[PDB]
């Protein structure tokens, strides 16, 4: 069931914008409320163009199928605001509102740019639950990073940004499209630039999760002082990245070791990763979520 | 990078140099 952009309607009497909460080369994100019920939504606004059509449809088709999982921000619907002949129309994407912002932002606003280890373990576990849902449905995210992990005002964790995700049709199937964000890309995805035979699968998302854990621990991905072109040369050649400080637990160090195995056929699968002690053993979840929520509110 | 685009990849997201 593929979306047909021509059938989308003007949102005239259904939602109203409230405040602008984000902006980038993609468009704008707004806080919005349903005018009839008052319920809260985020609304992403992009103007329409044939040139960005394929990614738009992939985002909407992926969200409609999978966003009902509690670790994926929920899709509510879409509209197209109709503007006069000289002016582009705009697509509105109506989503579950994630009021705490991104993990990248959380790190930026923290003293030393380093989260507490128990916070990192909780966030990583929530990301893996989302990945598990996706991988079991033959989906590869392909752009896992702190900018695409959001937090609600109650410290729930939600994955976003499905525009370059891959939908396979067989379990064993593989992909070869050279796509991602450089510092978080897996060595077997990078290899597709110069190697027209290379392939990757769902384990490339697990590499990116490893880089995102390092992002949370140290404030940036590895090689953040290299130009992107040099990072892309060094990721397949350097040994796998490690945490700089010996103060982290052996558990955390072991988990980073499991995500960042360079040989992807020897990298553990999502299910095995879910059983790692760093992820599996969190008996103080209630306390951790409270501390995260309070830290989030402290940082404004 | 922040803004660096290489072929079909997203923006660098982390850097420049």
């Amino acid at each position: 069931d593929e979306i047909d952009l021509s059938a989308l309607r003007d949102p005239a009497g259904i939602f109203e914008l409230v405040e602008l909460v984000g902006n980038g080369t993609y468009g704008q994100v707004y806080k919005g409320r349903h005018v009839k019920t008052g319920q809260l939504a985020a609304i992403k606004v992009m103007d329409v163009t044939g040139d960005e059509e394929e990614e738009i449809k992939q985002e909407i088709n992926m969200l409609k199928k999978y966003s009902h999982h509690r670790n994926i921000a929920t899709y509510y619907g879409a509209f197209i605001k109709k503007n006069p002949p000289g002016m582009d129309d705009q697509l509105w994407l109506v989503m579950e509102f994630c009021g705490a912002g991104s993990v990248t932002d959380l790190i930026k606003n923290t003293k030393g740019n380093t989260l507490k280890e128990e916070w990192i373990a909780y966030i990583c576990r929530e990301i893996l639950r989302g990945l598990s849902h996706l991988h079991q449905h033959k989906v590869i995210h392909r752009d896992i990073k702190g900018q695409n992990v959001l937090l609600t005002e109650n410290a729930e964790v939600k994955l976003v940004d499905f525009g370059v995700s891959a939908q396979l049709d067989r379990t064993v199937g593989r992909r070869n499209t050279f796509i991602g964000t450089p510092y978080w890309m897996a060595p077997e995805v990078i290899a597709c630039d110069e190697n027209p035979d290379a392939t990757y699968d769902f384990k490339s998302d697990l590499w990116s999760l490893g880089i995102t854990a390092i992002e949370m621990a140290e404030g940036a991905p590895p090689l953040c002082d290299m130009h992107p072109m040099r990072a892309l040369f060094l990721i397949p050649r350097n040994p796998a990245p490690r945490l700089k400080s010996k103060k982290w637990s052996k558990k955390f160090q072991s988990f980073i070791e499991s995500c960042l195995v360079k040989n992807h056929s020897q990298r553990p699968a999502t299910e095995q990763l879910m059983k790692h002690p760093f992820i599996r053993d969190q008996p103080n979840e209630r306390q951790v979520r409270i501390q995260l929520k309070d830290h989030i509110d402290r940082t404004k | 990078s922040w803004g660096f685009i290489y072929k079909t990849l997203k923006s660098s997201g982390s850097c420049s140099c």
Side-chain angles (χ1 to χ4, degrees), chain A residues 168-225:
Chain A
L168 281 51
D169 46 40
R170 326 250 155 199
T171 294
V172 74
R174 306 176 71 73
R175 293 294 262 254
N176 67 20
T177 290
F178 177 60
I179 187 46
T181 302
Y183 300 91
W184 290 261
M185 294 174 47
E188 67 268 10
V189 180
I190 288 163
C192 293
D193 179 39
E194 324 203 62
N195 205 334
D197 222 52
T199 49
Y200 54 89
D201 54 22
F202 61 103
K203 287 153 157 211
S204 69
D205 283 341
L206 306 177
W207 181 277
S208 307
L209 169 67
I211 307 288
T212 305
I214 289 180
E215 183 179 7
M216 289 190 267
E218 298 175 357
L223 312 171
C224 63
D225 61 337

Side-chain angles (χ1 to χ4, degrees), chain A residues 10-220:
Chain A
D10 197 277
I14 308 126
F15 279 93
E16 290 273 282
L17 312 179
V18 168
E19 99 165 300
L20 166 78
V21 290
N23 200 3
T25 79
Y26 63 90
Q28 298 84 243
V29 177
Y30 293 83
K31 190 204 267 186
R33 284 190 184 276
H34 195 280
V35 339
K36 230 178 205 213
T37 61
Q39 53 224 353
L40 207 48
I43 307 176
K44 190 211 215 152
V45 169
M46 319 149 265
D47 23 61
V48 317
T49 157
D51 197 62
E52 321 265 5
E53 200 174 288
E54 203 196 352
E55 308 198 346
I56 271 293
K57 312 237 215 196
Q58 182 75 325
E59 169 128 50
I60 293 169
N61 296 342
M62 286 302 91
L63 289 174
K64 296 199 328 273
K65 268 181 308 183
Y66 302 119
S67 78
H68 59 89
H69 194 273
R70 74 183 204 68
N71 294 121
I72 302 181
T74 308
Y75 169 78
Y76 297 155
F79 310 88
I80 286 169
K81 169 118 184 71
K82 272 116 171 83
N83 297 320
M87 180 186 349
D88 305 328
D89 294 356
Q90 292 154 302
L91 183 103
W92 292 20
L93 227 59
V94 175
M95 312 280 297
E96 158 179 29
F97 187 73
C98 295
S102 73
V103 168
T104 294
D105 293 334
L106 181 53
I107 295 162
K108 253 65 190 205
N109 298 330
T110 301
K111 189 268 151 164
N113 308 294
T114 174
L115 303 193
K116 300 308 278 197
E117 185 175 315
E118 75 209 292
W119 300 352
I120 300 183
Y122 165 71
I123 295 164
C124 282
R125 178 171 82 178
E126 295 301 283
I127 293 155
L128 259 181
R129 282 166 173 177
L131 293 178
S132 191
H133 177 69
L134 293 175
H135 292 167
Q136 308 318 114
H137 283 98
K138 336 275 202 220
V139 172
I140 315 187
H141 189 280
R142 310 216 273 198
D143 196 22
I144 293 298
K145 59 180 169 193
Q147 163 189 146
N148 290 337
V149 184
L150 311 191
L151 278 284
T152 71
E153 78 154 303
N154 291 307
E156 301 145 299
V157 176
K158 316 275 197 191
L159 306 179
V160 297
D161 201 3
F162 282 77
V164 300
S165 65
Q167 171 71 83
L168 281 51
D169 46 40
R170 326 250 155 199
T171 294
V172 74
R174 306 176 71 73
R175 293 294 262 254
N176 67 20
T177 290
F178 177 60
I179 187 46
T181 302
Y183 300 91
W184 290 261
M185 294 174 47
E188 67 268 10
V189 180
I190 288 163
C192 293
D193 179 39
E194 324 203 62
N195 205 334
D197 222 52
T199 49
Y200 54 89
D201 54 22
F202 61 103
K203 287 153 157 211
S204 69
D205 283 341
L206 306 177
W207 181 277
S208 307
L209 169 67
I211 307 288
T212 305
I214 289 180
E215 183 179 7
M216 289 190 267
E218 298 175 357

